[PDB]
Structure 1
Amino acid sequence: REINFKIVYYGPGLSGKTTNLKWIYSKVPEGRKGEMVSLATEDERTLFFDFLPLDIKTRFHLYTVPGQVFYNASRKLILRGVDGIVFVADSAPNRLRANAESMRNMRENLAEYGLTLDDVPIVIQVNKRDLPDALPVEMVRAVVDPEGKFPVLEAVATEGKGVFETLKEVSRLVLARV
């Protein structure tokens, strides 16, 4: 009947993690989706997580994690059992370091589960390519994936650009392991 998979969206505050789910939700037909759930603060910064369940019998559970540094304890929990990860990096000059800290943070959290960055498929999304001062892609990429060992996709998640292909690619990788 049905295999279940968990996908997590990771990355620094404001990089667009929640926006990816909002897009995806707005374009998947009713019949291939359940309702989206968000536990967010008053300023729509995610506090616990987002959750969106979907069809592609293979069921994908997508989650977002809160990116702000001081929400680490909830971030940890949301990675439990993860099967595939989308790391959404920010394109803004002033957020490059935020990117790297979040990546170092993701290795630290996985290591508490006994997992390395080799153990879970990971897809890098460089989001926010519309910004006037957008850093070159390979610079942002060099910071997060110094060895180029992870697929890269460019995105403007506020407009849909890259949202689904990023999703397809992490999907592709998770199935290729099963």
Structure 2
Amino acid sequence: STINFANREINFKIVYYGPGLSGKTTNLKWIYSKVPEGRKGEMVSLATEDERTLFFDFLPLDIGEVKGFKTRFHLYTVPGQVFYNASRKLILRGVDGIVFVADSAPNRLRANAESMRNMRENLAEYGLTLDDVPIVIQVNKRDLPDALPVEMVRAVVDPEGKFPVLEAVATEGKGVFETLKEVSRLVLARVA
């Protein structure tokens, strides 16, 4: 799948993961809203009464062309509140890099912790640990008044300081493309 000879594309999958309502859809809508019509496909949203998923692909202008191959990024997330683990497990199939979108709200601090234990455990299903996959932490919602300090959030999701961290206010685009740029850098660094 990653190499498509017929279209001369290399495909990478980036998953936005994190607790429900932390800003993953918003990140996806902002990125989509900025790509030119000729460089992206359809945004696809799947929903049963109980589960959800959301994705689209696009050709980032910022990446160069090896041997005539353009790069194509496929962005995925499970949006909304989760009732079943199934679509989280499946969203990680063939993942190349991960953006963890943590929430700043004080009453969402455990949810951040829980969501990261859950991702670690979903990775494990595929034989992957947190070291095997580029992970970027986005600490979203820097604007809300009682917003916890970045290091307190980072303390519960990445207690060893192993992952790049970035601030965002995704409703306004701040941090959104820096975060994507950071996870991409990591993904491409592995292919060299």
TM-score w.r.t. length of structure 2 = 0.84
Residues 94-103 or 45-54, more deviating:
45-54
Q: SS of the residue aligned with 1:69?
A: coil
C-alpha spacing 1:109/1:42, structure 2 compared with 1 (3 Å): closer
Work out whether residues 83 and 174 of structure 1, in 8 Å CA contact, stay in contact via their aligned partners in 2: yes
CA distance in 1, matches of 2:41, 2:56: 16
Displacement of 1:84: 0.2
Displacement of 1:35: 1.9
Work out whether residues 10 and 85 of structure 1, in 8 Å CA contact, stay in contact via their aligned partners in 2: yes
The superposition leaves residues 105-162 of structure 1 with CA deviations (integer Å, 9 ceiling, x where unpaired) of 0001000111000000000000011101110001000110001100001000000000
C-alpha spacing 1:47/1:3, structure 2 compared with 1 (3 Å): closer
Work out whether residues 58 and 72 of structure 2, in 8 Å CA contact, stay in contact via their aligned partners in 1: no
**Which of 130, 138, 145 is the matching residue for 2:158?**
145
Tell which structure's C-alpha radius of gyration is larger.
2
C-alpha spacing 1:155/1:48, structure 2 compared with 1 (3 Å): closer
Q: SS of the residue aligned with 2:37?
A: coil
RMSD: 2.7
Displacement of 1:59: 0.5
Which sections of structure 1, spanning at least 5 residues, go unmatched?
none
Work out whether residues 15 and 90 of structure 1, in 8 Å CA contact, stay in contact via their aligned partners in 2: yes
CA distance in 2, matches of 1:122, 1:59: 19
The percent identity for this pair of structures is 100
CA distance in 2, matches of 1:100, 1:14: 14
C-alpha spacing 1:44/1:135, structure 2 compared with 1 (3 Å): farther
Residues 1-10 or 30-39, more deviating:
30-39
**Which of 121, 133, 136 is the matching residue for 1:120?**
133
Work out whether residues 51 and 82 of structure 2, in 8 Å CA contact, stay in contact via their aligned partners in 1: no
TM-score w.r.t. length of structure 1 = 0.91
**Which of 37, 42, 45 is the matching residue for 1:38?**
45
C-alpha spacing 1:23/1:52, structure 2 compared with 1 (3 Å): farther
The superposition leaves residues 3-25 of structure 1 with CA deviations (integer Å, 9 ceiling, x where unpaired) of 11000000001001111010111
Work out whether residues 91 and 134 of structure 1, in 8 Å CA contact, stay in contact via their aligned partners in 2: yes
